[PDB]
Amino acid sequence: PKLVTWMNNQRVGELTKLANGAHTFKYAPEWLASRYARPLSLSLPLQRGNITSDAVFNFFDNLLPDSPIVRDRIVKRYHAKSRQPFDLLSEIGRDSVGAVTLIPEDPIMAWEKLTEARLEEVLTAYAQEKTALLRIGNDWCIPKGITPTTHIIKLPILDLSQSVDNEYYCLLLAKELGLNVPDAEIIKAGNVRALAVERFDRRWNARRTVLLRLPQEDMCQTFGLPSSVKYESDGGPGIARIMAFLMGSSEALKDRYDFMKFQVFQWLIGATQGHAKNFSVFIQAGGSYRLTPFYDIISAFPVLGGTGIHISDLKLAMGLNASKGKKTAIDKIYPRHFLATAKVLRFPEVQMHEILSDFARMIPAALDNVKTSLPTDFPENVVTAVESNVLRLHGRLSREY
């Protein structure tokens, strides 16, 4: 009942599942002795004894997809012993988010190039269902052994049939507006259209002979919480808890500014799904941390008017301060709410003003610039929907900034 936990080529410790179902973790002495040792999670601090808190089960369970439907698929695909976490990671824990590599108790870089036909096949087998591949030059490949992947691959997902184009667009816009986000590309293989997002939890060495995994954990993990409480309405962290947390980042000022800037950005693009698991931090040597780039960005604008949903129904996953409580409706949110929030969280008014004024003058040019990076077959309705609504909200920044 053990899975050895590795960080690149270093043994970190072991995950054990006792006979009664309890999960425990124990760091390896060689790991702890390193003057550069870092915990697996800020919720699992470095220590010599057996860790038995719920933070253990929660940390590892948060490495898996949230969806029971996706988990059944995983058990079926690898014939996993059960749907239980320990058993799923026994099958797919070799390459996961961050740098944790889980290998059953019972290297050289190598890979296999895939043909367009083969790539189409691989992708047609896949909250949503996502996989990962290794990019070598302009070819998509399957890594061999412990060789890591470099890109998260997402398939189309309320008609969220254009979620691939939606996210591509949002990521391009975020980058154009100065936000820290991964690059992405729309890949076409036969009749499949998927989004390949470059992973920021991976890094090639200078000579390109070794691809390293970078340790990171999302906000539920960092707080020892189960994925079940990822939404603030369920007791999960919101802007206040995360901002407080970021005070201790090795890049406090830049991370708080970036996180606040991103809240304004989600509001402008109608991103209604920015829950706690959509934020992560890199865990660095010694246990210090800093915010990773932003990810999993999708606009709810292209889904408007569909199932009868109006713009008035769009709500931010993490609310802002309101005179009498919180402000969550994108359609009712204005700059005063961001400034009121900045104030109570001790985020400088001058910085909040800069963020608002920068979007005020840059949005129109950013929207035009993004168009050159869209493929000829990009769905116009997505551009139309996001563009018109972003400009509509952007007007509110101009009637003051």
List residues near Cl ion by CB under 5 A: 327-329, 332
- Shortest Cβ 141–Cl ion spacing (Å): 47
CA 316, CA 101: separation in Å to the nearest integer? 34
HEC readout, the chain: CEEEEEECCEEEEEEEECCCCCEEEEECHHHHHCCCCCCCCCCCCCCCCCECCHHHHHHHHCCCCCCHHHHHHHHHHHCCCCCCHHHHHHHHCCCCCCCEEEEECCCCCCEEECCHHHHHHHHCCCCCCEEEEEEECCEEEEECCCCCCCEEEECCCCCCCCHHHHHHHHHHHHHHCCCCCCCEEEEEECCEEEEEEECCCEEECCCCCCEEECCEEEHHHHCCCCHHHCCHHHCCCCHHHHHHHHHHCCCHHHHHHHHHHHHHHHHHHCCCCCCHHHCEEEECHHHCEEECCCCCCCCCHHHCCCCCCCHHHCEEEEEEEECCEEEEEHHHCCHHHHHHHHHHHCCCHHHHHHHHHHHHHHHHHHHHHHHHHCCCCCCHHHHHHHHHHHHHHHHHHHCCC
Between 37 and 329, whose beta carbon lies closer to Cl ion? Answer: 329
CB of 325 to Cl ion, least distance (A): 9
Task: Give the residue with the Cβ less far from Cl ion, 272 or 328.
Answer: 328
Shortest gap between Cβ of 320 and Cl ion (angstroms)?
Answer: 9
| Measured CA distances, 105 to 46, 196, 260 (Å) | 22, 33, 44
Structure tokens at 304: 């408007």
Q: Are strands 139-143 and 2-7 parallel, antiparallel or unpaired?
A: unpaired
CA angle at residue 136 from 132 to 142, to 5 degrees? Answer: 40
Of residues 312 and 381, the one with the C-beta less far from Cl ion: 312
Nearer of residues 328 and 341 to Cl ion, judged by Cβ: 328
Handedness of CA 245, 251, 257, 259 (dihedral sign): negative
Query: Cβ closer to Cl ion: 134 or 269?
Result: 269
Nearer to Cl ion, 28 or 339 (CB): 339
Place of tokens 């076409």: 188
In angstroms, give the least distance from the CB of 305 to Cl ion: 21
Residue with Cβ nearer Cl ion (51 or 342): 342
What's the closest the beta carbon of residue 147 comes to Cl ion, in angstroms? 48
Nearer to Cl ion, 237 or 319 (CB): 319
Q: How far is the CB of 273 from Cl ion (least distance, A)?
A: 17
CB of 243 to Cl ion, least distance (A): 20
Kindly tell me which of 267 and 282 has the beta carbon lying closer to Cl ion.
267
Give Cα 237 to chain centroid, integer Å.
15
CB closest to Cl ion, residue no: 329
In the bound state with Cl ion, the residue whose beta carbon lies nearer, of 182 and 335, is 335
Smallest gap from Cβ 294 to Cl ion, in A, equals: 23
Q: How far is the CB of 314 from Cl ion (least distance, A)?
A: 10
Min separation Cβ 337 and Cl ion, Å = 8
